[PDB]
Amino acid sequence: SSSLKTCYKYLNQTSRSFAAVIQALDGEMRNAVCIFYLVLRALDTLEDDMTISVEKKVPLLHNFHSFLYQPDWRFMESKEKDRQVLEDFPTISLEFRNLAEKYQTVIADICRRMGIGMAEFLDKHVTSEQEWDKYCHYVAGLVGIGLSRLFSASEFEDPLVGEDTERANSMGLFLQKTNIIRDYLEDQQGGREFWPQEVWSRYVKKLGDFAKPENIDLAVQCLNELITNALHHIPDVITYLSRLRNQSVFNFCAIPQVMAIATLAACYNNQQVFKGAVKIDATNMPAVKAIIYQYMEEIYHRIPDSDPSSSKTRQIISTIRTQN
Numbered sequence: 001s002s003s004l005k006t007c008y009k010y011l012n013q014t015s016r017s018f019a020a021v022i023q024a025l026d027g028e029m030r031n032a033v034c035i036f037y038l039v040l041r042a043l044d045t046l047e048d049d050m051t052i053s054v055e056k057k058v059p060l061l062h063n064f065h066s067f068l069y070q071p072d073w074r075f076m077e078s079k080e081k082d083r084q085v086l087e088d089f090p091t092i093s094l095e096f097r098n099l100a101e102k103y104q105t106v107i108a109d110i111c112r113r114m115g116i117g118m119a120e121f122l123d124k125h126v127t128s129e130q131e132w133d134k135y136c137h138y139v140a141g142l143v144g145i146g147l148s149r150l151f152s153a154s155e156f157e158d159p160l161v162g163e164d165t166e167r168a169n170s171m172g173l174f175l176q177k178t179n180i181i182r183d184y185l186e187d188q189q190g191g192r193e194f195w196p197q198e199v200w201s202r203y204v205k206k207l208g209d210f211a212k213p214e215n216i217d218l219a220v221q222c223l224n225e226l227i228t229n230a231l232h233h234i235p236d237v238i239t240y241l242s243r244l245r246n247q248s249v250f251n252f253c254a255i256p257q258v259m260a261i262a263t264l265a266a267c268y269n270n271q272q273v274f275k276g277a278v279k280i281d282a283t284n285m286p287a288v289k290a291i292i293y294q295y296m297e298e299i300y301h302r303i304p305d306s307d308p309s310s311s312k313t314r315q316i317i318s319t320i321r322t323q324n
Ligand SMILES: O=P(O)(O)[C@@H](CCCc1cccc(Oc2ccccc2)c1)S(=O)(=O)O
Pocket: 018, 033, 036, 037, 040, 041, 044, 048, 139, 140, 143, 179
């Protein structure tokens, strides 16, 4: 139908690099995961728009899931760039309602909980590392949780896929953290902060000081510390994919992880993270594994003894080598 063509039209307008893997999914997953994406995309577009006042935003975010069953609803007052998905929501929420009930449930659930969770972190920055996980859990982990419950609901994946929330969480925590990390300049010049204060704060006195070239030294030290943090998810990742049994689902999951891993390798001990831009076989686990193990070595081979988190980086690479 024509509202569907529009939905995949939006999927491509907005998704930098999922478009292809989503449209390649087998069966009812395709559309389940296309609409799922568009819904969360709408939700985020709201969260990120800083022209929307907090008192106006918290309600939107909270009640957003409910808008899924309000055919006529839409948001016209947005100034963010992906704002078509909101101005023309009714179309999305319509295809949502054509989704099979078993899929609407998962979607509207994760939608409902992301909402109460994004509105949570509007007031405050991300202070500690337990919080960084928490915020990454909300925006990203739940997507990881949610997708895998769609997978199993589709019957294209085992029940054991969607039962495993701890590792589905990890899949997203990892992806999300590498993005937070890479995005440091983009986030800081769009006036946002997601680097964990109790981390960055003991290299510098305010976060923006990393955009200063008189500070790059300490900047990379913070960058590596966080990378090492992010690397700690790579085992759960390897465990999660090792369980998948559908090529379409598998490529959907592997690719972005492998690509998250490349980004993290490109950024390690790398000035350009704070200067400009960072330029950078994955279709069976043991290929995927080999590929992961490879990038790990690159990290390893550039850990300077001086860097105050050398032992940790090596420490967690050594565990990834000899795990599973
Ligand atoms: O929360 P952030 O860091 O701003 C990030 C949006 C993350 C929330 C989100 C939106 C849309 C899709 C999404 O995850 C999916 C969901 C379904 C299919 C593929 C990916 C997660 S964004 O960089 O894309 O804005």
